[PDB]
Every structure is written in structure tokens, then in C-alpha cells.
RNA sequence: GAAAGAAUUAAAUUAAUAUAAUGGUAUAACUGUGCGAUAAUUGUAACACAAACGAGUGAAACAAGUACGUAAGUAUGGCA
RNA sequence: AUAUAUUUUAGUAAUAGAUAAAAAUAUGUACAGUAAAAUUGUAAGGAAAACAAUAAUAACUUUCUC
């Protein structure tokens, strides 16, 4: 009985609720489900017949399978293979399924869904692939944030942004949203959730918010603008919210300048990109990198060139898009930016 | 309004139709839903295993046949030729019946023709 | 509409966007029909299928043994022939259609452990021709079919028009039902045991019957349908019984293999084979 | 003479009319379009009172 | 005797703006009856499948690797460019506006929602 | 001339809400010509049937054996 | 009265002869004692039959030879000589006095029914 | 080794498309479908195409509102 | 068992599928799929009802498994 053992196995694989666990594992269908909170509703409810004995048999079967997998898993040396074996062992565990399905994945509590555990991480990845990743990809393609900034994306990390400091309200930004200048007045907060097996201690990350749609009237086209640039950020599967708490002033290659779209300049895409650092062998600890702060410019910014220079690989992305409103002038004034231009309504 | 034949047709139609004959939807609790999922997944896995076992057995049989026929070809050409014939109109014998739920009164016939 | 020009734009990523999942319109429809949470849920594997079990145990190995031909290579079918490039008019020319046929024919593979012939699907086509006069006859035929099978029939409509036979276009006329898996197996077992023996001068299924590739068929008269136990139960409610065609579809490469398979399930075969 | 022209008047008392063409038995038409005068969409009912072929009410409820 | 003396004045329907040519937003690059030529980069296709100018540039009839067995007629925003544009790259884009440098002009545009 | 049942307005089955037709079926025991019993699911209400003319007493299906 | 032996009958109808009527393989004396073995009080009508009883009724007819099953036996006895050199076969095949009756005149009857599968 | 999926190539525009004939069509215009039934809306239309004129044809865009779509969006009647 | 009230049922009717080349609406939008012909067939069935079958699997992923 491998799934009842918790000597070597993490605590997160068990259900933390006692009542739920008891309901799952009983000898007869006597008890009533903890999910149904209301007595009258519990009374009304009737579970399907014979479900218990069969369930128990299924558990035994899959428990045996897990145990067999574990016999292989411990003998394995290479890490990715071992992780895969662990996943195979525990993915069919009812308790872990309960934990994952019916508790929040975004702000996961460590005791319930631990992303340090490989199985839970795999589940989270699968969940991301099912909806959120696809949506992100659609928003990147439709809005034309991929070819315009950075050729392609192979989504690996799930990136979610927030604007907590400006207004007060709590809301994770859906990709391709129209945010007010009040909302995006102060800086955002990232959460880079990584689902691949990666060296947590060594692996650093960079985050770049880029505005491809600021108008350049000499060229009669647009230019990029690095609105916010962080480097050498340390992520951990559970500890992953990039906040002023975590990153230091040394990490900020270009400190947050807010979206201030001009009147009739149009809708401006702000597409955050998340890259992971190149990992160097034969060097213990996190390998930093120095950025030439005079070389990179904010008013015009070759993202692709920058990536080429520092050998980055874009793992994640997110995007919002701002256009002119009444408060952009106020935002500019607060930041000490100039009055802000006004263009002709007609694109002649 | 309607004839007796028309009425009977309507009744017949109703027998087939889902109009006011079907129950409520099968709702489950989350724990119950999980239990169901675990039952189904395990079953599916078991079925796959069984399929592989049978498939493997069939492959093994095929390999054995191949091994036999090569040997036959090597040794006795006439015997090999006899073995490897077109069995186009081969018919299973009508005595090899599909096994019933419960057996008959006379289990086995000792005399024939 | 400013234009009718259809032109799908290329993309800049290899992620496969399932558009259905991004909507919030059909939340019940996002679940698979196999899943318990879907309203489309049905218990599939309710009991042990008997004919299928028999096939698995006894027949499949026997069939494999029968079909072994030593060092048998693939027989390619009739395909679209390319032009020899002996003229510059061959350069963007469509390929010559197949030799005998207009449509391409499939390759016949050697039978191994993977591709042993087995039952794939049964279809019970009942087109009642008196229903050109009476629509109610189509309904009765559909009911009969349902009774026989335990499966939901689908209505057949008159696809064509013709004056000689008093037939309009778009008129409900009989019904069909594709049986698959366990219900189909049951239906076959009933046919073998109950119904076909009660047909008086029944020699069997013809050996000249069938597709070129793994499909065999036959038909039952209105006299033959009264032997089904569900109709037998209330023959009173089945005065005007209707005949039916029975298309058996196998996983057989060729038709003789399919015939052999059916024989394994106690179907008699009488005529001179092709 | 198989088609004619009616005079879809605007619910809002504006006078705006959107003359459209209809078959002889025109299911009393009612279209929701823009009333420039009142700067908003609004329903347009027929003006002169014509006629509709006896159209049977649909039997949504089972009867007789 | 009935005389088939009737026919229709042919429709001027061909390229109307040729290669390397300099168009302007909204010009007819090719009347056609049929999508013989499909709208391509920076061009628009009208009701009759007529192809028109969206950006002021240079018309370039070019095939396309993505869409095979088809032919486009686009309008790069500049001659130096080759309209069978790469793909995985930035897309040329044109801003098209003159910043109201007039105080009054800018004020009116801004003050007015 | 053509005898018909005239259709009422059809009931809108919404997408996702369509449910599979699970007909009411009884487990029915068929005893064949000889004493071999076989269970089959059947829509008609009869728990037991015994058959007179079957494959198990037809000469075509077993050549060797008012 | 019900679907007895398929083509059944009606109530009020005393069974004894009723069988002689619908059934072709049985009639008169045969139908008489057919009830006798099944022991049903004579002068008894169909409506009174206790369904289970009909069951016996059915089996009984299976025992002896009934229905068009015998129609054929004669059909063959006819075809027999007919297939051999048999005046009858001509008389029967041509539709003429098989009983050597009035071919010259009263023979329409023969022409009406006498034929290869006579009993039609 | 097997299943299952995702599909990919070939073939096809001979089917079909409200209707002639041609042109186009599977990247589908064609077909099924949900919703809806609104853009088979309302002011300025540049600019071309065609063109003697009167007329006609495409139509960027600005503005007001409607509809469907997660969204990109699309819609100022219909493949032309 | 059975009687009175009270109600509830039974007005018996098709599509159960994002359906897909039978007939139904031909403008919008959104999602999804591919046709016809021909040949081997098959109760009546036939030149002409309906129905079934009629190209290729490299690679890729997932699952089981020796």
C-alpha cells in the first residue's frame, strides 16, 4: 500500500480534509458527501449503487501499479526520466486528483497543490495547455504581438500579470485587455509559473514589457519602447510572484514607465515577454549577467537584437493594450513626462 | 380528429420518442465524481492491458508459424507446398457454436454423422 | 458583405489553438460524451459481450492461422497512374484515372497479429416502398427496427425522384440503424440462433454476395421478422411487418476472409464462391 | 404585379419612414432600424393597414 | 428570320495598375470577375472581387509560399521591399498622421471626445 | 392522397444538453430448443422465454448430430 | 379468439369445429378428438379458453400434420404422376377435368382451381 | 508491438452555388450548425474604374447606432 | 380489501446530434465538415427506390506493453 505511506513521499499527495478522505475510503456507503454542505441537500442526494467495492478494487489496482512504478523510479539516475516515472506512479492517485481539480491552481496553497511535486506540476501544465495557453497564443497571433516584436513563442511558463498598486482592486489581467491609464499608472506584478523540470537554484529569468506601437514621425512608421525591464530574477515553483519584495534595484535594467498613449495615435499593445537565462556548467550558484545600460535605449529598442546579445529564450508572454483617455495627461504629469502629442483623427 | 390507425401510429412513435419518458440528469458530488473517474480510468487501463496481452499472444503465434513454415520449406518442399495453400472457401464447422450463458441438457455428443 | 474572398492568414506559432475551449458558450459540450459530467453520458461497458468474447478466445487465433501465407507481400490496388513526361503538356496534368476503375482501390495487406479480420459494424436498412402512399408505415418500420435492435433508428428519406415508381423527393420512407459493439453482437447472435433457423427453405448467405473489400450482406422478408422475440412477444402490434437489408461490415481485407469470419459466428454459406 | 411597397413608420413619433418592398401577403412586417431624427435604433411598424393571408397559429402546446 | 444580333459591351476588366507602380489608398489594382488574383499584403478586395489600394506604395504581383496555387497582388509600402515578404519578422507599418502642431488644432481634437 | 401525421413545432434540443436514448430494457432468459439458457437484454416485458425452433434443433446448424 | 396459432378465431365460436375452419391440416373428426385429448367440455366457445389451455391447443396441432404443410404433400403427389406420363398431369397442368368430368362443358371449375399448385 | 489522436499528402471546384453563361470557389463562396433576424442602418464620402454627357462600378475613411464573436474581429444585403 | 376527499400522473409525437449533400429561409455572425461520379454488393429490387464499402500512412504525440 504505497499511497498510504508518507515516509519518503510528500504530504501534498494526501487530501488535507479529513472528512473527504473518510468519505473516499469507507467499507459501506453509509456516510454523506462533505461537498454537499446543506443537510436537506445531503438527505436528497443519493450516490450511485455498488460504487464503493468497485472503487476500492480500482484503488488497489492503481495503487499496485504505482508501487511497481516506484520500484523502477528509485533505480533511475537521470532526473527527467525519474520525474516522468514519479508522475506515472502518482497521476492516477484519487487524492492528488481531488487536490488538483477542486482547489485553486493560480494561488496554490503549498500543502494542497505543491508545484515542487512533479505530478502536481504535470497536472498544472496539462490544465494550462487545455485553455489558458491556447488563449494566450490566440491573443498573440490576432493582435500581432509575435512577428512585430519577437518572431515566435514556444509557451513553457504560464505568465499572469496584475496591477495591485495603482487602484486597489484585485484582478489578474486577461490577455489582450483594454486597461485604463489609471489602472496601469503604477507598475505590474508578474507570476511566472514554470511547469518544466528546471534547476530552481541556478536558473535566472528576465522580464521585458515592450510597446511596439509608439509612432515615429521621421520614419512615418512605429518604433518599439521598453516600458519595463527586469533581469536576473529567481523563481521557485511555489515562490514565483515577481514583486518589489523579491527583485532588487540592481535587477531593474529599465524601471517602469507607464502606458501614455497619444490622442488618435491608436491602440498600443504592451506585450510582456519572459525569458530564461543561459545556464553555464562548472559554476556553482546563480550565473548573473551584466547589461550595458548606455547601449540599450528605451525610446527605441530592438528586442530581437537584445535577445541575440544575451542569448535569451522566450518561455512566456502576456499582453494588454492601452489607448488614450482623459487621465493619461494626469499620469504624464505625475511621472513628469511632457504634455503629450495630439494627432489628426484621419490617417491620411 | 384522428383515426384508430393514426392513434396507434402515434403510440408507436411515442415508444421511440424521448418525450416525457426520461429522468433527471445524473448529478454527482465532487468526491463521488472523483471516485467515478478512478473507476473508469482503472477499467480502461485494465482493458488496454488485456488487449496488449491478446495482441502479444497473436504476435507470438504468428512468429511461431513463420518459424515453422521456413523450417518446412528447408526440409520437405512438398509438405511446405501442402501447408501453404489458398484457404479461400474455408468455413468454420457448424458444431463450433458461440458459447451460451448456461449449458444445455446434453453437454456433449459422443456419437455423430 | 464587402467581399466573398476566403483566405486563411498564416500564423507565427506551432501551438494548436482549440477555438471551442476559448469560448464560454457550450460548457456542457466541452466535456467528452464519455465523461460522467456530460448530459450525453451513457454507460457503455455494461455487461460482458458474449460473441466478442468467443471471437477473442477461439476464433481470432484460428483465423490468423488460416490466413497465414508464407512470405506474402502487399498487393497494391488500382491507383491513379501518373503520366510519363514524354511531352511538355504532361507538366501540370492531372494523373490518369485507374486502369479498370474510375475510383482508386485499396492495397490488400498480408494478415498478421494486428490486422486479423473481425466484425466492425452492422447496418439495418429498411426502405418501405408502400410509404410513398402512407407516412405512418415509415414510423411503424422504424419502431420495428428499434424493437429488434434496442438501438435508436434514423429515418430514411427519398433522395431521388422518379415517375414509374410513384416516388417523390424528400419523403420519409422507412429507417436505418448502425449497430456497433455489444448491441450489434447481440443482434448477430439473435439472427444466428432465433431468426434464421425459423426461415423454412434457408440455405444460407450467398457466396457471391458482398463488397470487394470486407463487407457482406443479405435481407429478410416481412415473413422473417415475425421470428424476432420482441415482435413475437406482440405479433398483434406487428400485422404489416416490413422487410430489411442487413449490411455487415468487417475489418477484412477481402471478402472471402469476411465470409470465413462470419462462418465462425455460425452463419451458413451456400452458393458457389467467386 | 407580384411585389408592392409599404411604408415602415417609426415607433418614436418622428415621422421618419423607411419604405421597403414586400410580397402581396406580407407577414405584417416590423423591422428594427435607425431613426436619424431620434439618433437611436427603434422598431418600424407598417403605416397603412394592409392584410396577411390566414397564417395558422403554431401549436407549441399539445392539443385536440 | 430571328437574328442573334445581341451581345453585351465587354467589361473593361483587367489589370488597371501594373507592377512597380505607385498607387494610393483606394485605387483599383485589378478589376476581375473571380478571385483570379487574391488580395495580398496591404490590399483590399471589393464586392466583385475587385482588388483595391489600402496603403500608398508599390503594387507587386507575387506568388506566396504559404498559399500555393494562388496569386496575389499586394502593395508594399516601399519599392525597396519585396512583397512576398518574409514572414517571421516585423511587419512594415505606416502611422499616417500629422501631429497637430497648431495649438488650436490640437486643443480642438483633444478637448473633444 | 398521401396519408401523413402532420408535424408540430419541433422542441429545441440545446447544444450540450442532448441526452442519449437509453431505452428501458429487461434481462430476458432464452432457453433454446435444448436446455441451454442464454441471457439477452430486451425491450418487451418477459423475464423468461423458451424457444421451439432454433439453430440447436435445425439440421443445417448441426449436420453431424395444428 | 386471440392470435391462437397465429390466424386465431373469435369468441362465442364453439372451438370443436372452429379448428376445422381456420386450420387446414385439421378438420371434422380430427378437430373433434383434438379437443378430446385436451379435454375441453364440448359445446365450449373460444372466449372461454383459459389462455394456458390454448398453449396445449397449439402444441396439439404441432403434433400431427396441419397448415399448408400438407398442401404441398398433395402438390407433390400431383406433380408425381404429373412428372411421370400421367393423363392427370395433363388434365391438371392444362387446367382440365382431373376427375375425368365434363371437359366438353362443365369444366370451368377445373380451369378455375385445378393447376400445378392447385390449393391456392 | 498495439491503440488512440492529431492529422499530412494525394484527389477533387466534375458535386454544389437563389437563376443563364463565363469567371471563382474545398484557405472553401459550398455544406451543417448556434445565435440572431441586426449592417436588406444613418449623415459627410477621398479616391480611383468606367466614361461624351446623363448615368454606372469598387471603395479607404470620419461620424451615430445595431448585430454576432473569448477574442482578432466581421457585417452599409446575396461568390461576381 | 375497500369507500370519500384531495391531488398527482397519463393530452402518450419524432431532432438527443454543433447534426453535415433528403425537404424545409437565399441577408448577418460564429463554429465545424466535405462533395459528385463511378464499381462490388444487398427482401421484394429491375437501367432507373434506399443502404453499405471503395487513396496513402512518413513523421509527431499520448497510453499499454514485451
Amino acid at each position: 500500500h504505497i499511497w498510504s505511506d508518507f515516509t519518503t513521499r510528500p504530504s501534498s499527495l494526501s487530501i488535507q480534509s479529513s472528512k473527504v478522505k473518510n468519505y473516499l475510503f469507507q467499507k459501506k456507503a453509509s456516510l454523506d458527501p462533505p461537498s454537499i454542505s446543506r443537510r436537506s441537500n445531503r438527505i436528497k442526494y443519493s450516490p450511485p449503487e455498488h460504487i464503493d467495492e468497485i472503487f476500492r478494487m480500482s484503488y488497489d489496482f492503481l495503487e499496485q501499479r504505482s508501487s511497481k512504478f516506484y520500484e523502477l523510479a528509485n533505480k533511475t539516475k537521470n532526473p527527467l526520466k525519474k520525474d516522468a516515472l514519479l508522475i506515472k506512479a502518482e497521476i492516477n492517485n484519487p487524492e492528488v486528483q481531488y487536490n488538483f481539480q477542486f482547489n485553486n491552481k493560480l494561488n496554490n496553497v503549498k500543502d494542497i497543490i505543491d508545484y515542487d511535486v512533479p505530478v502536481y506540476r504535470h497536472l498544472g501544465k496539462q490544465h494550462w495547455e487545455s485553455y489558458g495557453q491556447m488563449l494566450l497564443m490566440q491573443r498573440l497571433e490576432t493582435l500581432a504581438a509575435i512577428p512585430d516584436t519577437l518572431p515566435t513563442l514556444v509557451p513553457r511558463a504560464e505568465v499572469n500579470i496584475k496591477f495591485p498598486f495603482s487602484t486597489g482592486v484585485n484582478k489578474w489581467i486577461e490577455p489582450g485587455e483594454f486597461l485604463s491609464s489609471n489602472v496601469t499608472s503604477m507598475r505590474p506584478i508578474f507570476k511566472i509559473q514554470e511547469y518544466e523540470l528546471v534547476n530552481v537554484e541556478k536558473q535566472l529569468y528576465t522580464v521585458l514589457i515592450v510597446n511596439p506601437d509608439v509612432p515615429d514621425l521621421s520614419n512615418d512608421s512605429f518604433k518599439t519602447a521598453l516600458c519595463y525591464g527586469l533581469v536576473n530574477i529567481n523563481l521557485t515553483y511555489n515562490d514565483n510572484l515577481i514583486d518589489p519584495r523579491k527583485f532588487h534595484s540592481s535587477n531593474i535594467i529599465a524601471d517602469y514607465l507607464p502606458p501614455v498613449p497619444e490622442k488618435n495615435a491608436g491602440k498600443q499593445r504592451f506585450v510582456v515577454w519572459v525569458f530564461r537565462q543561459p545556464l553555464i556548467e562548472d559554476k556553482q550558484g546563480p550565473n548573473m549577467l551584466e547589461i550595458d545600460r548606455k547601449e540599450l535605449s528605451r525610446d527605441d529598442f530592438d528586442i530581437r537584437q537584445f535577445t541575440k546579445k544575451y542569448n535569451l529564450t522566450a518561455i512566456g508572454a502576456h499582453i494588454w493594450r492601452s489607448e488614450w483617455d482623459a487621465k493619461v495627461a494626469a499620469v504624464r504629469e505625475k511621472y513628469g513626462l511632457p504634455p503629450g502629442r495630439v494627432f489628426s483623427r484621419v490617417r491620411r | 380528429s384522428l383515426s384508430p390507425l393514426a392513434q396507434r401510429v402515434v403510440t408507436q412513435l411515442s415508444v421511440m420518442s424521448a418525450s416525457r419518458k426520461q429522468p433527471k440528469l445524473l448529478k454527482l458530488a465532487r468526491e463521488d465524481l472523483i471516485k467515478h473517474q478512478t473507476i473508469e480510468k482503472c477499467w480502461s487501463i485494465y482493458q488496454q492491458q488485456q488487449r496488449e496481452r491478446r495482441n502479444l499472444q497473436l504476435e507470438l503465434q504468428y512468429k511461431s508459424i513463420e518459424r515453422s513454415m521456413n523450417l518446412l520449406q528447408e526440409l520437405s518442399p512438398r509438405l511446405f507446398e501442402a501447408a501453404n495453400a489458398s484457404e479461400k472457401g474455408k468455413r468454420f464447422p457448424m458444431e463450433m457454436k458461440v458459447p451460451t450463458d448456461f449449458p444445455p441438457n446434453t453437454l456433449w455428443h459422443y456419437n455423430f454423422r | 458583405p464587402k467581399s466573398a474572398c476566403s483566405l486563411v492568414k498564416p500564423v507565427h506559432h506551432l501551438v494548436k489553438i482549440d477555438k471551442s475551449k476559448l469560448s464560454p458558450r457550450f460548457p456542457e459540450l466541452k466535456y467528452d460524451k464519455s465523461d460522467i459530467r456530460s448530459p450525453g453520458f451513457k454507460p457503455k461497458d455494461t455487461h460482458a459481450d458474449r460473441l466478442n468474447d468467443h471471437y477473442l478466445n477461439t476464433l481470432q487465433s484460428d483465423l490468423l492461422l488460416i490466413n497465414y501465407s508464407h512470405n506474402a507481400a502487399v498487393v497494391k490496388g488500382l491507383k491513379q497512374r501518373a503520366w510519363s513526361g514524354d511531352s511538355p503538356y504532361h507538366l501540370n496534368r492531372p494523373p490518369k484515372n485507374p486502369r479498370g476503375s474510375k475510383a482508386q482501390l485499396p492495397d490488400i495487406h498480408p494478415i498478421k497479429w494486428s490486422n486479423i479480420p473481425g466484425l466492425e459494424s452492422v447496418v439495418i436498412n429498411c426502405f418501405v416502398r408502400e410509404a410513398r402512399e402512407n407516412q405512418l408505415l415509415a414510423i411503424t418500420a422504424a419502431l420495428q427496427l428499434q424493437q429488434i435492435t434496442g438501438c435508436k433508428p434514423h429515418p430514411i428519406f427519398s433522395k431521388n425522384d422518379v415517375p414509374t415508381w410513384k416516388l417523390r423527393k424528400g419523403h420519409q420512407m422507412g429507417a436505418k440503424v448502425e449497430l456497433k459493439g455489444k448491441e450489434m453482437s447481440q443482434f448477430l447472435s439473435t439472427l444466428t440462433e432465433i431468426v434464421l433457423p425459423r426461415i423454412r427453405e434457408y440455405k444460407g448467405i450467398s457466396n457471391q454476395s458482398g463488397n470487394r473489400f470486407g463487407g457482406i450482406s443479405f435481407g429478410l422478408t416481412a415473413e422473417d421478422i415475425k421470428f424476432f422475440p420482441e415482435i413475437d412477444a406482440n405479433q398483434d402490434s406487428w400485422p404489416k411487418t416490413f422487410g430489411m437489408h442487413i449490411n455487415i461490415n468487417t475489418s477484412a481485407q477481402l471478402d472471402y476472409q469476411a465470409r470465413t469470419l462470419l462462418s465462425g459466428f455460425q452463419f451458413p454459406f451456400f452458393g458457389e464462391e467467386k | 404585379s407580384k411585389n408592392s411597397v409599404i411604408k415602415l413608420l417609426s415607433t418614436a413619433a418622428s415621422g421618419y419612414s423607411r419604405y421597403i418592398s414586400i410580397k402581396k401577403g406580407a407577414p405584417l412586417v416590423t423591422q428594427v432600424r435607425y431613426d436619424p431624427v431620434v439618433k437611436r435604433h427603434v422598431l418600424f411598424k407598417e403605416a397603412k393597414k394592409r392584410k396577411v393571408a390566414e397564417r395558422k397559429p403554431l401549436d407549441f402546446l399539445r392539443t385536440a | 428570320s430571328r437574328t442573334s444580333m445581341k451581345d453585351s459591351a465587354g467589361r473593361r476588366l483587367g489589370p488597371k495598375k501594373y507592377e512597380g507602380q505607385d498607387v494610393s489608398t483606394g485605387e483599383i489594382i485589378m478589376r476581375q470577375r473571380g478571385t483570379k488574383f487574391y488580395p495580398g499584403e496591404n490590399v483590399g478586395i471589393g464586392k466583385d472581387h475587385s482588388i483595391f489600394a489600402l496603403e500608398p506604395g508599390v503594387v507587386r504581383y507575387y506568388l506566396d509560399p504559404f498559399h500555393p496555387k494562388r496569386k496575389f497582388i499586394g502593395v508594399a509600402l516601399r519599392r525597396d521591399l519585396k512583397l512576398p515578404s518574409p514572414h517571421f519578422e516585423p511587419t512594415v507599418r505606416r502611422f499616417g498622421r500629422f501631429e497637430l502642431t497648431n495649438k488650436r488644432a490640437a486643443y480642438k481634437e483633444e478637448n473633444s471626445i | 392522397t398521401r396519408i401523413t401525421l402532420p408535424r408540430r413545432p419541433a422542441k429545441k434540443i440545446q447544444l450540450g444538453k442532448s441526452r442519449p436514448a437509453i431505452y428501458h430494457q429487461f434481462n430476458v432468459k432464452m432457453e433454446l430448443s435444448d436446455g441451454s439458457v442464454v441471457i439477452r437484454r430486451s425491450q418487451y416485458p418477459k423475464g423468461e422465454i423458451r424457444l421451439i425452433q432454433d439453430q440447436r434443433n435445425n439440421p443445417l446448424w448441426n449436420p453431424s448430430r395444428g | 379468439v386471440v392470435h391462437i396459432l397465429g390466424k386465431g378465431f373469435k369468441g362465442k365460436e364453439v372451438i370443436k369445429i372452429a379448428l376445422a375452419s381456420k386450420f387446414y391440416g385439421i378438420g371434422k373428426t380430427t378437430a373433434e378428438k383434438i379437443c378430446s385429448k385436451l379435454g375441453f367440455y364440448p359445446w365450449m366457445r373460444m372466449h372461454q379458453l383459459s389462455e394456458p389451455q390454448i398453449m396445449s391447443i397449439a402444441s396439439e396441432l404441432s403434433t400431427m400434420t396441419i397448415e399448408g404443410d400438407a398442401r404441398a404433400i398433395v402438390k407433390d403427389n400431383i406433380a408425381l404422376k404429373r412428372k411421370i406420363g400421367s393423363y392427370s398431369g395433363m388434365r391438371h397442368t392444362l387446367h382440365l377435368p382431373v376427375r375425368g368430368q365434363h371437359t366438353r362443358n362443365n369444366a370451368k371449375t377445373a380451369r378455375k382451381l385445378n393447376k400445378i399448385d392447385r390449393r391456392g
Side-chain angles (χ1 to χ4, degrees), chain A residues 67-315:
Chain A
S67 312
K68 287 168 191 174
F69 271 119
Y70 269 113
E71 200 186 334
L72 303 174
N74 297 317
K75 296 174 189 175
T76 312
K77 296 181 183 179
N78 61 332
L80 61 95
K81 197 80 77 172
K82 190 167 188 173
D83 274 53
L85 263 306
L86 265 309
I87 289 157
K88 267 144 186 168
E90 220 73 28
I91 193 162
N92 295 340
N93 191 351
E95 290 190 289
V96 317
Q97 228 64 8
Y98 173 91
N99 275 30
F100 183 78
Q101 289 178 263
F102 301 110
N103 305 292
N104 64 333
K105 295 85 155 163
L106 214 171
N107 294 295
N108 64 309
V109 303
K110 182 154 180 174
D111 62 307
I112 300 285
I113 296 161
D114 188 12
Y115 289 126
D116 299 321
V117 177
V119 182
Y120 278 116
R121 192 138 36 76
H122 170 85
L123 265 294
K125 189 196 155 186
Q126 198 155 293
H127 186 72
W128 186 47
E129 286 188 341
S130 305
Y131 169 77
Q133 189 193 244
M134 289 179 178
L135 191 141
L136 183 267
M137 288 278 87
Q138 200 194 39
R139 296 328 169 82
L140 285 173
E141 184 54 51
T142 50
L143 303 175
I146 3 187
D148 291 45
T149 62
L150 190 69
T152 334
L153 177 55
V154 277
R156 279 151 190 168
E158 177 176 8
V159 174
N160 319 73
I161 73 173
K162 192 179 285 187
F163 287 94
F165 307 127
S166 69
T167 307
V169 312
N170 196 14
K171 186 190 164 180
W172 296 105
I173 306 303
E174 189 201 58
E177 266 185 359
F178 272 97
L179 308 183
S180 322
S181 201
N182 176 219
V183 172
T184 191
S185 191
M186 254 153 283
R187 79 180 69 208
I189 294 305
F190 316 109
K191 181 131 81 169
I192 300 92
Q193 179 51 261
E194 192 78 67
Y195 295 118
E196 289 193 338
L197 203 189
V198 61
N199 196 345
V200 169
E201 294 179 310
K202 290 194 186 181
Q203 186 62 279
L204 296 177
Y205 297 87
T206 60
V207 179
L208 297 177
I209 312 193
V210 180
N211 187 5
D213 309 334
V214 307
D216 186 31
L217 308 181
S218 56
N219 202 243
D220 197 22
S221 315
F222 305 83
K223 56 187 182 170
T224 28
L226 173 54
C227 106
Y228 188 32
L230 300 166
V231 304
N232 304 322
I233 305 163
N234 177 45
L235 281 285
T236 304
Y237 294 127
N238 299 40
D239 323 317
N240 52 353
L241 190 76
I242 309 315
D243 198 283
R245 297 177 227 167
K246 284 206 164 199
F247 67 85
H248 212 72
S249 189
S250 57
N251 295 11
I252 303 163
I253 61 163
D255 204 346
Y256 182 78
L257 261 54
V260 280
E262 290 100 317
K263 172 54 162 281
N264 299 303
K267 303 147 191 304
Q268 302 191 348
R269 300 189 303 282
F270 282 80
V271 43
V272 60
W273 289 101
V274 170
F275 314 81
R276 86 204 322 170
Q277 248 61 283
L279 218 75
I280 295 178
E281 300 187 327
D282 311 324
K283 282 191 176 182
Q284 292 277 29
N287 178 245
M288 300 289 178
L289 71 98
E290 284 287 307
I291 297 84
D292 297 16
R293 300 208 172 182
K294 293 192 175 182
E295 294 289 311
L296 95 165
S297 196
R298 298 191 67 167
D299 65 312
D300 53 309
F301 184 68
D302 294 319
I303 183 71
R304 223 168 290 198
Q305 187 60 35
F306 180 92
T307 316
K308 196 193 178 189
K309 187 177 281 184
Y310 301 108
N311 199 42
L312 275 44
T313 71
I315 64 168

Side-chain angles (χ1 to χ4, degrees), chain E residues 29-79:
Chain E
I29 315 181
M30 190 185 187
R31 297 219 161 284
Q32 47 169 349
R33 291 274 181 278
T35 54
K36 278 179 165 299
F37 272 98
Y38 295 99
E41 187 154 2
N42 306 353
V43 112
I45 180 167
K47 173 157 64 51
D48 69 70
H49 309 95
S50 273
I51 265 60
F52 60 83
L54 285 174
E55 288 85 345
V58 167
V59 180
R60 319 197 64 79
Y61 304 63
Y62 63 93
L63 280 59
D64 183 339
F66 291 118
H67 321 294
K69 301 185 169 188
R70 291 189 174 185
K71 312 171 83 305
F72 300 67
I73 294 185
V75 180
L77 319 167
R78 259 206 316 267
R79 320 194 62 89

